[PDB]
Write a protein that binds this ligand. Structure first.
Ligand SMILES: CC(C)(COP(=O)(O)OP(=O)(O)OC[C@H]1O[C@@H](n2cnc3c(N)ncnc32)[C@H](O)[C@@H]1OP(=O)(O)O)[C@@H](O)C(=O)NCCC(=O)NCCSC=O
Ligand SMILES: CC(C)(COP(=O)(O)OP(=O)(O)OC[C@H]1O[C@@H](n2cnc3c(N)ncnc32)[C@H](O)[C@@H]1OP(=O)(O)O)[C@@H](O)C(=O)NCCC(=O)NCCSC=O
Ligand SMILES: CC(C)(COP(=O)(O)OP(=O)(O)OC[C@H]1O[C@@H](n2cnc3c(N)ncnc32)[C@H](O)[C@@H]1OP(=O)(O)O)[C@@H](O)C(=O)NCCC(=O)NCCSC=O
Ligand SMILES: Nc1ncnc2c1ncn2[C@@H]1O[C@H](COP(=O)(O)OP(=O)(O)O)[C@@H](O)[C@H]1O
Ligand SMILES: Nc1ncnc2c1ncn2[C@@H]1O[C@H](COP(=O)(O)OP(=O)(O)O)[C@@H](O)[C@H]1O
Ligand SMILES: Nc1ncnc2c1ncn2[C@@H]1O[C@H](COP(=O)(O)OP(=O)(O)O)[C@@H](O)[C@H]1O
Ligand SMILES: Cc1ncc(C[n+]2csc(CCOP(=O)(O)OP(=O)(O)O)c2C)c(N)n1
Ligand SMILES: Cc1ncc(C[n+]2csc(CCOP(=O)(O)OP(=O)(O)O)c2C)c(N)n1
Ligand SMILES: Cc1ncc(C[n+]2csc(CCOP(=O)(O)OP(=O)(O)O)c2C)c(N)n1
Ligand SMILES: [Cl-]
Ligand SMILES: [Mg+2]
Ligand SMILES: [Mg+2]
Ligand SMILES: [Mg+2]
Lengths: 559, 557, 557
């Protein structure tokens, strides 16, 4: 049938189409998840409006992909999960997005309202389970209110401190029909509001910088979310202050900028008398701004959108509450009427240069060491020389990610996605799929350890199914953080042990991708060149030394 | 060196944790190590506990509750702080829905760093509480034996459920004097309770008055270890019975009194239904029309008093343990002279519907054409299933059709999506079954979608020498295949890869992989996989449009 | 007019809610009306339900659970949206801690206005859930009979607890055809369940071997309506027993086998303790040292299997209903021929310690000097309590000393702060008792601090003609008086008004007020208050430093 010559009603619309039109109206371009009861019509309706749907292999990776796409696009992107266990699997993405202050829209199906209390198929208190992990969580009780709830959730997830929003969609709401003309419209959510700091706070910030003898600027991913790279790069060029990038703050300032103190991080944090926080929290990543990693009398200028975050752990001398791009614009404006810049010759620049040269001399022999099995720094020598300038880099593991953080530079903002503020394993291939869906014209390279790849390695089939040429590089030392000798007979396997002889790259051959196995330093170069030139996804399985480690440091990263 | 003097009067929280777990009968611990639970896993191995490192906490949390169901005592799940606990919330929810015991042990950031934004600091007890029978943080190391005892008892006693113990870093590493730690009692078997005698007699009176009676055997009886009692009751009453999905095995599926081949007719026409440890939830279609008679009479045997009369009123309430109460029914039946007659119109209608459904699927079971349908595939699978095997089913058509084509003869020998209808339990359940029962064959039959939820755990099986048999029925999508995405249009949301070579994942970890497209290959491939001394994967490219047999009603409705 | 044609086919949610509550035995409804629950209370009265409007939702939620405990079925508390439900969270938490049934019915803003910031919009199911056995929102009017039946069943069956139903405005006012409303079954009596016979015999084995046995009668037996079987068990075993605070009355407090006068000695020296519906929580001092023997043996009779062996291991577990299991023990006592011997050293030590404690308080009971101590005041109070009275006790010294000086001879005749130690239950419990048992005297004895929590509810009693007798023991502070502040110093945080004339609050609402400062006034004032046909307040000013009898251990420790 379906003949156009035949009369049709064509005056009604159902909840799935309203959800699709509302999502597209609010800038949702990507939807990751796994279909089934009752959200099959939602994914189909999303495709009719132009929303790109991506079927994953686990809702855990799907929820991670939604927030990564949100951080990259700047607007909340969707995750579609089924009722019951589909939502519980997605709680991983809600908690992770909450800790990173990233937006996210989780759309979870539910059993029909008329069956509540009966023990229906996958009936669950889904709003209650998700509420403590979301900025916004509500159930859409009737289809004609879908435009209201979608605009509500997107605005709550995008405005202020970004967080996750959850919308519960019962099956009878998805399938319920309403008159096309009887549905109330909803306004389109615009750019998140930016606010400014008082003028006396701006001048007090510039005064404190001039009074500092060993100043240090710390650039966090809050500035990347603000798209403040232009303002920050103008601020560092105008002030000539040394800066330190956070893990995912890399790229906002080019990693090869001569004012970076990355190769002297411990000394810079320890000896600085004044610290300028740019969208960065004094949490575990920055060692709480307290001893034994900071001077007891460290002075703090804190720029954060959340007023409650000011003075946490270490008191802030100058508070700058508001948007990063807007406030740094003020600082650049107020600097134009001043002749102060950090002088070109100070003992502080002298000490930073020495510590950078000292740390480079410590890792230099390991970078050149060609003996097999290879160490971490030897592996990254061949990786780094082949990472394009506009690449998007996903990092996951312990030594693989942390050493890769210092060996893989980023010259553009929002081009690094790692374990983040939650220290999460399982974001690897989910972040890569999101990066490959948002920037299909840019290279996507995921560098994971053997343990990290096992959390989401099945998502490699997702990439090959949607033609995503993701370059997965596995650093297999045979365990979690460290290799282990093979157990004697009767001796159980070590709890951290994995499979050092595993051929993870054959998973790529299972889904039409390219697989490469490396055990010798002479194989590494040609194996990476082949995986880069391969028109499709690839896996390079590098068997590294079991005892390999990072260069020694005065303090432990966790302490 | 033993010559050097050493102080030995102190013990930390990880070792007290291991000793308490071993004392309470915890034999298996699944999880992934890392800060701060590494000492817990190491100390557990020192006390003889079997630790099994998984590839995702999601599968680890599913394996723990499966081992708890098989062993009959709460088993452990060890996860790191923060996202390790959040990833394991899947198992807590699934254990809660199935009324299975489970003990989740989650690490936590140091207490003295709370509020500072510590690494993986999280309100873990608050998140897990709505999914647990019991949830509490261990504040001091000297109270570990107390909390482990109370947690295991709360998971095991009464209606079983999940328990959670939060272990901060400072508690794990904190030392205490060994002679000062307060001992804890050992949690015994879950207490059993009986029904009043007039309830037992009223239940037998209702059975004798029924013209079309039906006993429904649920997995509560499998949990209660009541197979001997149920078998005696069915044998002496001659009552027809229907087995729930995981209730299969309590009665052997080849028993002549089974109505499984006429399930829809039995539920719709029965004038009396005897629920043995089974809920009137979605699996039994709520005991209501259009699947049941409006006047259906219910005898309900359940351990939870609040469950009696849900959806459909219960004429006779039997609240208590399934083994003890069926034992009462066997004893009260001795003092009578009744069994359901050997020739009734009810028995003839059941036999006629059974034969009718047999003739409906007979051409599909014999059809050798390629690509094969589901029933043709299971003809070779069922012919090679040992009678003592443990069967893991996962998917939609693969699991549902596998439920009718793969019979069970021992209780607690099928593990499927369960009452939650969960995808992601496949290889986690198989790893659990392979650990608890190393001398028995473990066969997991999954769809191509269900295998992707936990397919990484094949490395866990190969690393621990578990000869798991994974048979993948690949139709190229979720529930149904799909033609190629054409005309520049996107792929269908349910579509996966029909040409995927999942068996190559087995060769990634030293296992054996077999690829089957033709019906002539299925036999030799299954023979080789079963004889291979190690884990194996059989990937079968079935027809994209293959479906189950037509029914009067949809399974969900 | 009746001559006019009217359409009687439709019915709204408020009327359906009323008929469902009446069908499920809800006779009493306490609360405060307003948006949107006004049609609910009016509909309840139209079905014969007694509605009682309180002055605070705190006392309403408390009066509901007390009326439930007194009737044996869940009674209703009706509150408005937002702050009405939050004010009622007090009763939910208290009902959960005491294992008492309760049905809280909370109004809610219209569903079509959710997310808009509607009047008193609140996540009311989410806030109430961690305090209820059952919490759910009624989404459509046609499902009201279903939700009311399931809520009453959840609150009544198993271990009792609180139930919450969320009633949105559009559900209350929404209409549906009567003929299409799905009917609901009537929730019957809570199911009882027996203990296995080998546990019954093992329990009697332990009792025969014990040299110093002690039975403890908890209020779980009073809820089970087991007074007949407990009185038969004690009489035939001739065992010493100890009543818990609200377990008083199950056995008559004047029974010669009571060890109430030697409570501390009986607990510390007993080699076997028989818990009858009593927990080893703070009330029974955890069954642990320094209040019990290290190696004390425990027979524990509880309905909750998870409660067995808490703090102190249970040697013999008796999981099931109190009345039913004690009935088994009485049957098994016939096959035996054992009683605890008439002359044992254990009986001589109990009698000597009872006589010692009476000689320690005898001078205080006899001291006629004014201002009076606690025991002198209770001398005239106890002599004027009818044997069929209902005693409400609240405060610290007032309640604790009143527990030992006001005997109960019938069960479920005493209501006090309970397992939560709540201040604010006084006048709410009294209104509940006066509503449920109008033919019995209701005497409430409160401290000055406890009366301030709910004293405004005296207007409710006068408004409904409840002759509640309120006796205030005013020492001018919380647990202890205070010298008036001097030298410009601030008032003590525990101090109140020692010269307050609380009895004038009774005169504000037509009741009778009496003020007492000397022992010569106490008698005549109590007589005139008991005879006054109406509610009354007797305000007694006691010595600021009056205290309880000294003990070896503090009640809390
Ligand atoms: C918390 C941290 C920000 C702390 O940072 P650090 O590791 O201490 O500093 P890094 O920037 O990583 O650099 C490490 C050291 O290398 C030096 N360094 C940096 N760059 C260079 C270059 N280019 N050349 C030579 N040396 C270099 C730098 O000065 C440091 O030495 P020094 O100056 O001498 O210190 C980070 O470790 C982190 O985010 N880790 C992730 C934790 C996580 O999520 N793990 C996964 C879950 S773990 C499951 O248990
Ligand atoms: C809810 C159910 C218990 C309903 O059971 P049914 O499928 O209706 O009955 P089944 O026992 O499975 O058998 C199906 C039909 O085959 C008949 N049958 C049974 N055994 C046989 C044999 N041996 N031979 C021939 N025919 C048989 C039986 O009488 C039924 O026909 P009729 O008598 O004619 O009916 C079950 O479908 C179920 O639990 N499904 C799991 C749902 C799930 O979790 N899916 C994954 C998530 S789905 C994501 O959206
Ligand atoms: C926790 C308790 C069960 C502990 O019981 P005890 O007070 O120790 O025992 P009681 O039965 O009350 O009796 C106390 C003592 O009086 C003795 N006693 C009892 N009857 C008599 C008679 N008739 N004559 C003489 N002496 C007697 C009894 O043997 C005890 O002495 P000895 O045997 O010599 O010890 C109880 O105190 C309680 O429930 N308190 C409630 C606390 C509360 O909720 N407060 C409100 C919130 S508090 C705000 O901070
Ligand atoms: N638009 C914005 N402008 C300024 N600050 C922001 C903005 N958005 C988020 N932030 C802040 O950035 C902070 C994120 O810091 P964090 O993620 O800990 O940085 P890092 O982990 O890179 O050190 C949050 O406290 C958040 O309040
Ligand atoms: N020892 C026991 N005795 C009796 N019933 C039990 C026991 N343990 C659990 N149960 C009950 O068994 C029921 C399980 O039902 P369900 O999982 O729905 O069965 P199925 O899914 O096999 O139909 C639960 O309601 C639970 O209360
Ligand atoms: N019908 C019943 N039969 C037996 N025990 C019951 C019954 N109903 C409730 N209980 C149990 O009685 C116990 C109440 O003890 P508790 O409130 O501590 O009494 P007390 O305060 O007098 O010591 C609870 O553990 C509850 O599970
Ligand atoms: C969700 C989650 N699970 C587990 C961990 C614990 N742990 C921290 S890093 C890591 C993997 C480290 O090993 P690997 O990925 O192989 O990198 P390597 O250090 O060996 O190079 C894990 C599993 C975690 N942080 N998060
Ligand atoms: C955690 C979870 N996610 C999603 C679903 C939805 N859905 C129901 S069955 C199923 C898989 C069905 O496909 P498959 O495993 O290939 O079996 P098939 O029917 O195709 O043979 C899924 C994903 C679910 N039930 N649980
Ligand atoms: C809801 C609540 N509020 C406060 C308390 C604290 N406190 C315990 S008893 C009590 C009052 C005791 O004093 P009173 O009622 O005057 O009797 P008294 O001991 O003075 O004779 C209070 C307020 C409590 N237990 N519960
Ligand atoms: Cl090179
Ligand atoms: Mg590794
Ligand atoms: Mg499929
Ligand atoms: Mg007082």
């Amino acid at each position: 049938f379906q003949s156009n010559a035949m009369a049709k009603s064509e005056g009604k619309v159902n909840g799935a189409t309203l959800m699709a039109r509302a999502l597209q109206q609010q800038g949702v371009q990507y939807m990751f998840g796994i279909v089934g009861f009752p959200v099959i019509p939602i994914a189909i309706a999303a495709q009719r409006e132009g929303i790109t749907y991506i079927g994953m292999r686990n809702e855990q990776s799907a929820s991670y992909a939604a927030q990564a796409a949100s951080y990259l696009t700047g607007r909340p992107q969707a995750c579609l999960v089924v009722s019951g266990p589909g939502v519980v699997h997605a709680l991983a993405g809600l908690a992770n997005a909450q800790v990173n202050c990233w937006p996210m829209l989780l759309i979870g199906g539910a059993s029909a309202i008329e069956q509540n209390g009966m023990g229906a198929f996958q009936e669950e208190r889904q709003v209650l389970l998700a509420s403590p992990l979301c900025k916004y969580a509500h159930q859409v009780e009737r289809p004609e209110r879908i435009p209201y709830y979608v605009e509500q959730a997107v605005r709550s997830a995008l405005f202020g401190r970004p967080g996750a929003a959850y919308l519960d969609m019962p099956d009878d709401v998805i399938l319920g029909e309403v008159e096309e003309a009887a549905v109330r419209p909803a306004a389109t959510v615009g750019e998140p509001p930016r606010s400014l700091a008082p003028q006396e706070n701006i001048e007090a910030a510039l005064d404190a910088l001039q009074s500092a003898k060993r100043p240090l600027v710390i650039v966090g991913k809050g500035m990347a979310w603000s798209r403040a790279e232009n303002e920050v790069r103008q601020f560092i060029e105008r002030t000539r202050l040394p800066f330190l990038a956070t893990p995912m703050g890399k790229g906002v300032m080019p990693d090869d900028h001569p004012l970076s103190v990355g190769g002297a991080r411990s000394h810079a944090l320890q000896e600085a008398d004044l610290v300028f926080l740019l969208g960065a929290r004094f949490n575990w990543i920055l060692h709480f701004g307290l001893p034994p990693r900071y001077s007891k009398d460290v002075r703090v200028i804190q720029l954060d959108l959340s007023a409650e975050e000011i003075g946490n752990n270490r008191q802030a001398e100058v508070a700058l509450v508001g948007d990063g791009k807007a406030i740094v614009g003020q600082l650049n404006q107020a600097l134009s009427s001043r002749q102060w810049f950090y002088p070109a010759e100070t003992p502080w620049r002298e000490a930073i240069a020495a510590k950078i040269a000292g740390n480079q001399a410590a890792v230099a022999p390991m970078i050149a060491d060609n003996t097999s099995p290879m160490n971490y720094y030897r592996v990254y020598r061949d990786i780094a020389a082949r990472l394009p300038r506009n690449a998007i880099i996903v990092g996951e593991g312990a030594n693989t990610m942390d050493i890769g953080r210092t060996q893989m530079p980023n010259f553009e903002p929002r081009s690094r996605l790692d374990a983040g503020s939650y220290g999460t394993m399982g974001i690897g291939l989910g972040f890569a799929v999101a990066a490959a869906a948002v920037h299909p014209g840019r290279p996507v390279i995921a560098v994971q350890g053997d343990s990290a790849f096992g959390f989401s390695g099945m998502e490699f089939e997702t990439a090959a199914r949607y033609g995503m040429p993701i370059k997965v590089i596995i650093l297999n030392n045979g365990g979690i953080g460290m290799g282990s000798p093979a157990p004697r007979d009767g001796q159980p396997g070590m709890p951290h042990a994995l499979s050092h002889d595993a051929r993870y790259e054959r998973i790529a051959e299972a889904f039409g991708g390219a697989g490469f196995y490396v055990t010798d330093s002479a194989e590494l170069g040609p194996a990476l060149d082949a995986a880069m030139a391969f028109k499709g996804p690839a896996i390079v399985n590098i068997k590294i030394a079991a005892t390999a480690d990072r260069k020694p440091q005065q303090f432990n990263w966790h302490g």
